[model samples]
Target chain A: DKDVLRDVWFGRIPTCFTLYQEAEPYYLLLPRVSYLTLVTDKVKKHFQKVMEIWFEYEGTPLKWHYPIGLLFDLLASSSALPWNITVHFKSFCPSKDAIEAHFMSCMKEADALKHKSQVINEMQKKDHKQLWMGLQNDRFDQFWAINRKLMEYPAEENGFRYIPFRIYQTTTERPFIQKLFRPVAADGQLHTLGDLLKEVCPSAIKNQVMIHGIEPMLETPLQWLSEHLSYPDNFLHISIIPQP
Target chain B: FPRWKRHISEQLRRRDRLQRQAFEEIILQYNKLLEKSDLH
Candidate 1:
């Protein structure tokens, strides 16, 4: 369990923290901490619901409508997870381009910002800052172009749709899962899959973890990960924690 | 046509202003929440 936890946490921190620094904290932390165990289950359900609603409404032209408000209401109604549903709802209202740009800017600053050496060092340990910058470079676009084609069209002139719809739900769905279930462990450490389910499921569970309600201080999960990871340029130490 | 374009541009400028205002409002609210949470 410890090994798995280490691997998963280490593997994800770079990507996760990059997003964390950029996004609305409520959206990432609330789900990650509260539904730590049930994230997979909830996301499956949420994806299904999204699909059903899209179909039911006959697929409204995918406008840049921020559906966070509606999503918060839906999650509150359906899930027992303790979160300020409104916070999560608002977090999702921004366009992906906006979100990506925000995150990329943070990455760039972390890499090159003056007087942020401590933050960059922490981020470098986890290799998050580099990967984050890489994503903004040509790597991500190239990867996406190839990956999208493989998964979506595979046939002659492969068009894309959600599998549950037509396009790959996995890409969007994974982030939601990552957002919801990624939590600090019961021992005040981060838990792995086995620890979350088999070891700590019964005795150490909290009713709901607050997400997006606060900024990260020195000891919060974000700070903790950054401190340990040694991100490049020490940017992690100085980066502003995203607002709830 | 010139008048129509001007009108449309003016509307777009107004819309952009509103969106920026809304975004700032949201950030202010978030900062307030953050301060409260930090105290706990």
Candidate 2:
């Protein structure tokens, strides 16, 4: 699931540019100037919001937990849950190994929690040191802590990428479609998300397995919206090609 | 003035072209690293 998320995020960054160009030409050049800066700011703000919400709901004790589950839970509980969320893997330093390792640890901790809960019918009380060590051992802990640090220093030199949110009708169903826009240099025209995906994942059409409930809003003037969106005016638009 | 404009345009064009080329080269290098990395 983590790898799936990362692949989608990484793929979406370049795909967003294509979308922007096709959907919003005015912002085409804007990413080159301000994408990273705006994404960094947004990531920080988003992280902070996550922290606040967790503190309010779960308490600060769990603040160090990696936010993926919290984010999922938050969206799940929201009145208007995100149909889908897009994240650019490039928005931060691509710590692929670290992120994956953290995710694994989170699974381990979650499994342990489940076992403990089933046996004890409640969480076992532990000392601060023990709790802290537990957090450190969890995969999400380092990622969360490092993310907090990254948020603190948004301008400390980093890559930038786009991530989108897609809301799910229900957590059980896959997304209707995961679409991404791409720029076609030959024609200087933006390709629809469907067109782009077909090139990359030929089997995407056949699988029809949407990860979430989100669907591509290809016809909407997404580019115009993106221009006024929270991102800054300048961000790097790295080209997208298949990873070797 | 026309000649000067042409010269400036050519220079700017050349510069932009070079920059794009350089960016593409860097991307290629980065892609190579990405391939080596534990992506999955």
Candidate 3:
């Protein structure tokens, strides 16, 4: 389990960033867990000479607020390796501080679903910084030290109050699918990954479901996946891609 | 151990290796591209 967490933290995508102005392409190894605005300064300076540049993958403008891995999984997974992204000097982006705030907002929302805001609300301001700083600095030990609290539930309970997940599909105009989903069914049977999609995202049925750029088996239990496979924000970011 | 747990463990091992392979292959490709170009 610790190995899984560490592996997720250290994952990276070798990306080729081309300029929309039709110049040379910049190659970068992007961290899977980091946001675009957090790690692309060098890429920006390389082009320079660059908004706050924007990124587009196959005509869809990438969201800087989304995790680079999530964007890649949703947009570039099926395309090719060394993901090709076009950089534009137009508009749209944020700063590291702003991303920190966004990260906290996500944690709050995730905790709300998990423990009804019990665990996070109890933490001190410094504790919050620890999680953010750990993530920002790429300190796995630091981040998980604080993150473990939010992942906890009574041993008696099957899992969190509700699983924190967002199902994203580019084919639809809707942003993503997010709703209250219980890990345990009314009959006390634990729900599988397939069960969640069956309940909320029928469109995702028979399609590929990806997280952290890997396709987990549908039979995997949601409770276990939520505990072991969720991002640092404490939410499971699921990307539903069309099968080729 | 349950069959599901065993499968998940195997899946995770594959995921870890695949993640590393994907990143390394990209870097290898990029390096080759650089070597062929005048930018070395």
Candidate 4:
């Protein structure tokens, strides 16, 4: 099951990139675990005469800081293959260090939810670097060696202080749902994925909910999903796509 | 740790395959989509 981490790290989405009014689409595999700012360099170079290099699917603007997979699951999962993305001239974006900072910020936020910042705050600079460098360098083993500590809980505890998660619903006024959701209820019943979505957006339960491009059974426990299925940023990013 | 242990030891251990399989299945679907696009 440790290989589950490796599976997540290596997951990719075939992407076909076209610049607006530009000829010839560029094709590449967008790493599911990576940020667009970090992984889309070749796409930019392919259109280099291009900055503020904003991207869109159909017409909606893409957030560069988001994990490529999260954006895909949120906006384009049900769309055609080679997930068609349009290149627009106006990002005001793209910096490795900047994206790294964003990723680190998310990690801290996730830790705040899981451990009240106890585990992550105590780590040394080098430990922090290992986590960042592992993701930056795409070293799965190195990354988890440091991350396993963040996932830990007291032997007596069933799970984390709160599940670190975000539920993205496109139809909503707000962009996404971020809040404290415990893995276990007060009566000692463990919560499931369906329970999480029901709390945040009950309407989503009727539609499709996806993480990492696949839907697990609603009955699956949230704690296990958080441990095995979370993105490198350490959040279970759930996307709800409405069906016809 | 009681019920958690039973849950992890009994069901979760056997279910890791599902997660890995689902990921592989998506990768396969993605590859097929790319190939089909190239074909037609």
By DockQ thresholds, what CAPRI class is model 2? incorrect
Clashes per candidate, residues 3 or more apart or on different chains: 37, 27, 0, 3
TM-score of chain B of each: 0.50, 0.50, 0.48, 0.42
Q: Give the Cα-based TM-score of candidate 1 against the true structure.
A: 0.22
User: Taking the tens digit of each residue's C-alpha lDDT, what string does model 2 give over A1-244?
Assistant: 2332222222211111111000110011111111222223333233321111112221212122223232232232232221123322222232334543443443333223222122211324232223333333433343333222211212321211122222222232223223333233245443333444445444444122222112233332222212111111011111111111
Question: Weakest 10 consecutive residues, lDDT, candidate 3 chain B?
Answer: B31-40
lDDT of 3 by residue, A56-148 (tens): 888888786788888888888887677898888865468678999999999999998988558898999999999999988889999889998
Please report the candidate that would top lDDT against the real structure: 3
lDDT tens digits, residue span A118-171, model 4? 788899989998999999888998999999999898767899999999888863
Kindly report the root-mean-square deviation of model 3 from the true structure over all alpha carbons.
Answer: 3.0
Q: Which candidate has the highest DockQ of all?
A: 3
Q: What stretches of model 4 exceed 4 Å from their correct place?
A: A49-51, A90-92, A171-173, B1-40
Q: Is candidate 1 or candidate 3 better by lDDT?
A: 3
TM-score of chain A of 3: 0.94
Stretch of 10 with least lDDT, candidate 3 chain A = A43-52
lDDT of 3 at A239: 89
Q: Fnat per model, in the order given?
A: 0.00, 0.00, 0.33, 0.00
Cand. 1 Cα-lDDT: 0.27
Error in Å for residue A67 of model 3: 1.1
By descending DockQ, how would the candidates be arranged?
3, 4, 2, 1
TM-score of candidate 4 versus the correct structure, residues matched by position:
0.82
Ranking by TM-score: 3, 4, 1, 2
lDDT for A2 in candidate 1 is 25
